[PDB]
Symmetry: D2
Subunit: 326 residues, 4 copies
């Protein structure tokens, strides 16, 4: 059978206590996760290890770099056929995108979590993990970038987002859709992601060091004032992503603050709070002010790309090109 490395980071998939909720994220080790499925041993040899044991609300760059380094080392090993990472669902979409930009392998990397804790009635993690391992061993899963497998569905990491606080079907791809299906391990792909990933990426771990450039996200709303934006500047942000209203829009006072920050060399990205769709110029002439539009990346994924962009360049045109290509 193929060997799959399983890298556990924590998350509700490993959470425990209760059957009706009542749990901590974060709790059981990477070997109890395997005891509840082992029809698993029919499809892969699993090499499990613990990278961290946290709720993903506590995900940070130290763990991202440990996770990415371990994943890359295993992907480089000819005895490893693919990697599955168990992860809390809250920030899974950010870790997936980060790995999609920094890992260099054609072998499948699949992130998976659970929206119900492992001891819940009707817990969802066992079948999600079976499926995830099924996708990671499938030959057609190679060369598609980092994948997320949840609730019988296969997503590309750039596209997938957590859209609901609690539903088991919370992950969706609101702009471009799921790239495949997996039903009790039967895997089918219907789409190939076109944005640059993994082996095609200019970012790589050997070139990166934590702390990454500081990038904050600023929310907007009626009655908004740029006081938190200015505080971000004062705390030495190198980039700021705005979760703007509608098509990345902001108040006049915000815009003047953004213009001044950009003129000082801070990179300003216009994203949106709305949850889907691309941000475009038009009401704001981005090129007039040096602003970057975040494509159809939501604020947290725009931040991931911006942080990596800023390790390479401060050139606005080049950064806008990265948002067109990644």
């Amino acid at each position: 059978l193929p060997t799959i490395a399983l890298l556990a980071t924590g998350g509700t998939i490993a959470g425990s206590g209760a059957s009706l909720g009542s749990y901590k994220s974060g709790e059981l080790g990477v070997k109890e996760l395997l005891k509840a499925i082992p029809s698993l041993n029919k499809i892969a040899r699993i090499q499990g290890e613990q990278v961290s044991n946290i709720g993903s609300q506590d995900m940070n760059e130290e763990i991202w770099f440990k996770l990415a380094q371990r994943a890359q080392e295993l992907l480089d090993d000819s005895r490893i056929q693919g990697v599955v990472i168990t992860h809390g669902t809250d920030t899974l979409e950010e870790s997936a995108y980060f790995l999609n930009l920094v890992l260099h392998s054609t072998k499948p990397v699949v992130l998976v979590g659970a929206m119900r804790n492992a001891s819940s009635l009707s817990a969802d993690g066992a079948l999600n993990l079976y499926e995830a391992v099924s996708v990671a061993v499938n030959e057609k899963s190679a060369n598609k970038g980092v994948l997320v497998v949840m609730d019988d569905t296969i997503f590309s990491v750039r596209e997938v987002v957590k859209t609901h606080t609690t539903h088991v079907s919370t992950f969706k791809a609101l702009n471009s859709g799921a790239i495949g299906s997996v039903y009790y391990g039967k895997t089918r792909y219907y789409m190939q992601p076109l944005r640059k990933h993994t082996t095609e990426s200019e970012f790589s771990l050997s070139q990166l060091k934590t702390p990454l450039p500081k990038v904050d996200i600023i929310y907007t709303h009626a009655g908004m004032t740029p006081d938190l934006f200015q505080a971000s500047l004062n705390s030495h942000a190198k980039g700021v992503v705005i979760a703007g209203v509608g098509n990345g829009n902001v108040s006049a006072g915000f815009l003047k603050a953004m213009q001044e920050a950009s003129q000082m060399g801070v990179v300003i990205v216009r994203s949106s709070r709305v949850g889907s769709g691309g941000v475009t110029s038009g009401e704001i002439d981005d090129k007039a002010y040096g602003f970057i539009t975040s494509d159809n990346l939501n604020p947290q994924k725009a931040r991931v790309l911006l942080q990596l962009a800023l390790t390479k360049t401060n050139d606005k045109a080049k950064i806008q090109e990265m948002f067109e290509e990644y």
Copy 2:
């Protein structure tokens, strides 16, 4: 015919220049809006006026109070059968919710905008406005709270959100659905909203003064630090809404900052960045720290309710009760 007051605030529905985009939000007056439909004059006498002429990204409390005061005065007039407000789509959902909580009338109040500027190819505002006026005159539109009519659909103000940066069908109700349909003016309702609105609300304009209590919204993501949260505190926020990860979750450092702020009397509301679903206790014991869960309100609508809550009380239990009732 019935008389409908039309209160114009600006927005892309009044934006102009271009046929392929290229426009300012904000631009044409409340009487050109009526020239392009007037089968309108077959269903209502329209009494139009300009309250403001801005893109809704510049919506603020001065305009909210002017708008609400004018709407209430017209609703109190026996010669007015309903009110239509034209508004930019970016913050329409916030203005609608604010009016839903402060206006006291059973007569229909309908907000409407356009996702394409008035001089676009296939501009959407003319039919949206025809429809909006159609809903506002319909007898079944009374006593349902403030309404939003967009793209052939009737929404309750608490439920409706802008979900996409640019699509004409951007407004959706992701938790509870649209309450009715309107197709070339033919109006049908299928649901009655149950949360408290308008005549049942404890908030009213005569009790409110701007500036409302300061409430900021703090975004969260992997690698988050509470530095912007602390800056909000330092700028004298009376309440803070957190756009938390997943089910309103935050990092350990965030949680400790939130706990300290709550113990000092700042009201902390856990909302979510994800876009849909209710925030619940569980991983966070809200009652242990005095935190409020934002129900299924997204961060910007949670902020609207919190600002009004704070004019009445600092009592956490009472504020959580408002989030259960409004």
Copy 3:
């Protein structure tokens, strides 16, 4: 504790064998369903019984009438506080609507199923059933018509449809939305259904006899010919629902066949194959031909209402009025 009657009909919620699929619909009895939850005994006394043990693809009028008669008798009993019906998901939406039109009680009736068989990894039935019982005991569940509880969500029977072949979140309300949420038994309602149900319905079991009037559903597509439509007529259909293309449209040859059938007294309802939205007149002048538009009912629910309509009247205007009211 309240007493809830549990009426089992079969379905994948009672299906068994396998952990990876491989099961029959239909298989385990109404008392094993209760062994896997019994935190249940903390919220209700359950009086279970088997009405049938079938996959819902074999649901028919004999079982509908047995089910409805038993439900009505239990609802009439002062010792019964509500009723939960376990049911296969395939035709759950039809049974729910039928019961919504024929049962006369204000007490809650809740239908529930499972998309994974009971012995699957991550089977969904235990928590769906816990939730269903939670909703059925809740005082706010009364007087809302028949309910469907699935996947943490509360639906009104008229609105809910199975939209996906296999996902656990397959049930949705595509026109009007879910009316509430239930999360580990915590029940909240946000909407009241407005169409006529249960105690407000003119249909009642004591007036109905099986076989109900024969009503067929005819599908449409490019290259369509009315040969199957004519066969329905030849097999003595009293009504025919057309699953038309787009806004209930049909080919010229279909239309002429429909016109002739209507002139002979067969009642023709224009529904749609598309899955959502109301069917309207316009391209077809329904009143010219005596046709009925099916509102926003999909073909199978339009058929349920039409069958009941035809026990009362052949009057087209009265039947169109039923499609406006139910």
Copy 4:
């Protein structure tokens, strides 16, 4: 500028009269369509012609073959850079899929329609057509199979379906998502379709003759009986697609009828009425009876593939392989 052939077939995009509905599908010629945009002449030379002038509810094989033959001849011409087809929305998804399987070119073919008639308030056709022409000239639109452009979105023909009776945003890809976006002509692709299309297809016009093999679609519901199925057999159907309940399920009497028909050489495809998801074996052992599962194709697109399959083979395994590959 590039030359784009525009092939008009009719549809609401060419419908006229009325500003509030009231129109015939079908009505204005392929040259008035061009008068209302001509910023068009800035992006392409348009060579327009009328193939037909019908509502798409009257689409049939005579027009499909005329349309396909003309499209292929133009695609074979070195002076033609791409083809846009204007079409009624009702059966657009079927024509698109048929062309995706029979046309052999790498140049873009784009189908487009309008959900509001051309003389409606806020008619959607002008911008949809501008966009469609924009996509058809874009170099990245080549080699992706037949495309559908509607409402600012780019779809692959296999994936796209009309989901709502009347909304302008009715077309969606419920399983795999849109492959790109187009906003006032700015075209971006995020996904490549993987199922076989156009140049990779084994079907081609030179091998096909109308009438194609007869294939009917049979709807299912509670209380179903195979009488219409038997009538299809009696009318010499070569294949039958079942719009089954849930995961392609049917009553016991249906199943026995299906088994007998298959044993006689009629090819039986299990699709679903639900609107999304793949049909799988499991409750029905398809290989036991010779049945074909329709993948995630809805009944009308399953019919298109089945008709073409039947011109090539009667071999069940080979036909199931086509449903795995196309």
